[PDB]
Write an enzyme that holds these catalytic residues in place. Structure first.
Site, PDB file in Angstrom:
ATOM      1  CB  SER A  64      -1.001   0.021   1.158  1.00 52.66           C
ATOM      2  OG  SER A  64      -2.195  -0.663   0.805  1.00 52.66           O
ATOM      3  CE1 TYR A 191      -2.933  -1.129  -5.136  1.00 50.36           C
ATOM      4  CE2 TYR A 191      -3.893  -3.270  -4.603  1.00 50.36           C
ATOM      5  CZ  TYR A 191      -3.413  -2.039  -4.202  1.00 50.36           C
ATOM      6  OH  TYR A 191      -3.393  -1.737  -2.870  1.00 50.36           O
ATOM      7  CE1 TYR A 243      -5.535   2.297   5.975  1.00 50.60           C
ATOM      8  CE2 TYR A 243      -7.099   2.403   4.155  1.00 50.60           C
ATOM      9  CZ  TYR A 243      -5.875   1.999   4.666  1.00 50.60           C
ATOM     10  OH  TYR A 243      -4.991   1.301   3.875  1.00 50.60           O
ATOM     11  CB  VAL A 261       0.094  -5.899   4.607  1.00 53.87           C
ATOM     12  CG1 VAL A 261      -1.232  -5.177   4.604  1.00 53.87           C
ATOM     13  CG2 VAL A 261       0.474  -6.335   3.190  1.00 53.87           C
TER      14      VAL A 261
END
Lengths: 448, 448
Positions: A64, A191, A243, A261
């Site tokens: 990410s 991705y 978030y 992660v």
């Protein structure tokens, strides 16, 4: 003498390394089996320095933390209008809610969440771009900021493709609403390769510094991205990087960040530093447990917080010499609105016209403001007005015998100036001249 | 010569004043009937300047723009722990959802929404504070930053109390969960008087500058608030000031702000400026239509954006003189981590020990980094490294004939230094001495 920062980092690596809570990403054995006893951290400064400690040279997939760089590339390739139609700027949790596309926007909330990243990858090169070109573009942008050619860990990629049902779910839904044009499978593969790019804590620190500087690579001084693009990217990292906990994180840490992660955490503090942190285990919300705590520590210990102001201000004015009939005004630093504004104040603080200034405030109503204004130099040091006050002094007792016919603007000590600063300062000069004052701009390396 | 900023503001007042969409707050006739043909704006600088235009001297009730100042006072009076138990840091819309107190926190989302403000007012002086003391404390804090005694418009207050059912609703629910101890009526009356305090665009601009500077009043240089408190307040303004549109607002504007239903908008950009905007009519979401657009204009035209870095950096180093055996290092500006870090780099850039530095990076792997490093001065101007590079030069060709026995640290040009900077710089000195180098710190006004 040895630099104290790296030692501080070493201390930090040892202290926070006393424990290792949470656990590694369990979804793929390649990550679930990765050695958890690793902890590295790196700081890349704006000027080109790199302080590190612990496992800062160990490679891991960026996952990410790749999202802001592809977002960046997409904005540069397609422009803001085309990207904004597909990607929003609203903070949200990774949990996907269809209502988010049913809105008249018909677009994922932002570029930090998966659905938002899938839309970004899709926009990567152009409408007629091939799968291979988009991946290469992703790998390229990350590589140009890292300063070295990066590679995709295909072992992790394969492990991931075998269990990409969730992302396929997102991509399919997105195609449904027309956010994706190509196949769900194609975009998810792109991705996923993207997230498998290998970087080290140091790579991230350097990549983050490029954003922190407004798009300039700290190790070369070459512009890698437009300042407007870097700005947007860091904006979304701050409001969406963590978030639904983004607000709390903005307040206790203040460092625009995004974690992956695999244990990696990327940071980027405008005008101050790029940060790379690495620690395999993740907390209950999916972020690198120590990586996140390392960022909170750097913020509290060094006051490295987005809301802790750190501007040039009046220091844009190196000094003011009233040699005689002529006044010498030397500038310095990175002149932008802050510095330009102070400059304009120095110029106005010279009597080059009927001095009928608008105090802005009534001395009668604010006696304290007058008192404080009296000790011009003290007031300046308390707020931080560099040498701007030397202007009122030049136009002080010295005016008592002789006017000001010439003003020399020396920019030799000025590193660079943005458009805003260039337009403000230029106007200042234009208005001085209009006062019958001669103005000469000594500018060795034509910066004006 | 006349200052160009006020003129820019005048231009802005005329341009955006070409139209006047939306409408005045309809809930109370006092606000629904207020003249809508008014538009003023003010900018208060960090150093003590005030540029304004239009109706900047017209009074109006501050309403919601009072929230960050009471939040501030509460944090100073009760401390962080006591306030955080009652007020969260999570962004949310003004629409109230009970689930928000059913959480184990049992507290309103943040200090920018009504429920959050009611909890703040309740904490205003202490557990044993009377209604009158809390109001006075609210009025006081706003008055000390505004720099003048402010007043409560009781006409608006009365008009509001006659229709305070919604706030009474909030206060009652909050008592239900134990967030409020006193009566719903008492706290709502206090919060409503609070919102009725009269201020002008100029008052807000100045009040916002106090937060922007980290707690220092720009007109006096006196510390009105702890830097940590001001930080928190500006943090929440940014993440919650514009409720659910906070993310979009962070990206298109980047100015921590909060508006009030009377047409007032407060802004505060760390290290750069305090902003007051006034325009009676509100848009569809309840904010001052022109006030909000004025902020977007200031950001785009001057690049006044939280994510647009503006630091001192290497400019903390005024210059480096290698007079002979002794080296002179002069510092300047507001030294914090950024400047301190650069200082530590200058010191390390002197050969005061077996120069076996850790390049951080492999020259073989990064040929470009080496090339760019070669032209030390160019690389510095491209990133913005002030005079730090002059250190490597002093330790350059000049070392070829004679070592460095003495280093003089002059702080005369330094305005002030925070603890972080003081600890980093002090350590630097401690480590230089350990190299058998004599170190003398010339510090006229004991700042170290």
């Amino acid at each position: 003498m040895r630099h104290p920062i790296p030692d501080y980092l070493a201390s930090l690596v040892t202290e926070l390394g006393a424990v290792n809570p949470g656990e590694t990403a369990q979804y793929i054995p390649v990550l679930a089996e990765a050695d958890p006893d690793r902890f590295g951290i790196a700081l890349a400064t704006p000027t080109g320095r790199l302080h590190c400690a612990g496992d800062a040279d160990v490679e891991f997939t960026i996952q990410s933390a790749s999202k802001p760089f592809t977002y960046a590339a997409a904005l540069v390739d397609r422009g803001f209008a085309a990207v904004d139609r597909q990607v929003g700027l609203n903070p949200s949790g990774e949990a996907f809610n269809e209502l988010s596309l049913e809105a008249e926007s018909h677009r994922p909330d932002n570029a930090m969440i998966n659905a938002g990243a899938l839309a970004v990858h899709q926009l990567l090169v152009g409408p007629e771009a091939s799968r291979k070109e988009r991946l290469d573009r992703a790998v390229e942008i990350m590589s140009l900021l890292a300063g070295r050619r990066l590679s995709v860990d295909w072992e992790t990629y394969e492990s991931e493709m075998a269990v990409s049902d969730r992302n396929l779910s997102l991509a399919h839904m997105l195609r449904s609403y027309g956010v994706l044009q190509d196949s769900a499978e194609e975009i998810v593969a792109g991705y996923v390769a993207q997230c498998a790019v290998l970087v080290t804590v140091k790579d991230l620190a350097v990549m983050g510094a490029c954003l922190a500087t407004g798009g300039i690579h700290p190790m070369t001084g070459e512009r890698m991205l437009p300042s407007i693009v870097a700005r947007r990217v860091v904006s979304v990292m701050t409001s969406s990087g963590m978030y639904d906990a983004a607000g709390q994180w903005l307040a206790d840490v203040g460092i625009p960040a995004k974690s992956g992660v695999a244990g990696g955490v990327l940071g980027a503090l405008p005008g101050r530093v790029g940060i790379g942190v690495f620690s395999p285990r993740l907390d209950e919300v999916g972020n690198s447990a120590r990586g996140v705590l390392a960022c909170r520590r750097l913020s509290e210990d060094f006051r490295l917080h987005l809301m802790d102001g750190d501007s040039l201000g009046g220091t844009a004015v190196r000094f003011v010499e009233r040699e005689g009939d002529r006044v010498f005004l030397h500038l310095q630093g990175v002149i932008r609105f802050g510095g330009a504004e102070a400059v304009l104040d120095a110029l106005t603080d010279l009597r080059t016209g009927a001095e009928k200034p608008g105090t802005g405030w009534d001395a009668a109503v604010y006696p304290r403001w007058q008192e404080a204004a009296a000790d011009r130099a003290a007031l300046s040091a308390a707020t931080g007005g560099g040498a701007v006050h030397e202007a009122a002094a030049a136009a002080a007792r010295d005016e008592n015998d002789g006017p000001i016919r010439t003003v020399v603007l020396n920019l030799a000590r000025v590193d660079r100036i943005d458009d805003v600063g260039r337009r403000l300062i230029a106007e200042g000069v234009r208005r001085l001249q209009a006062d019958g004052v001669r103005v000469e701009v000594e500018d060795p390396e034509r910066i004006l």
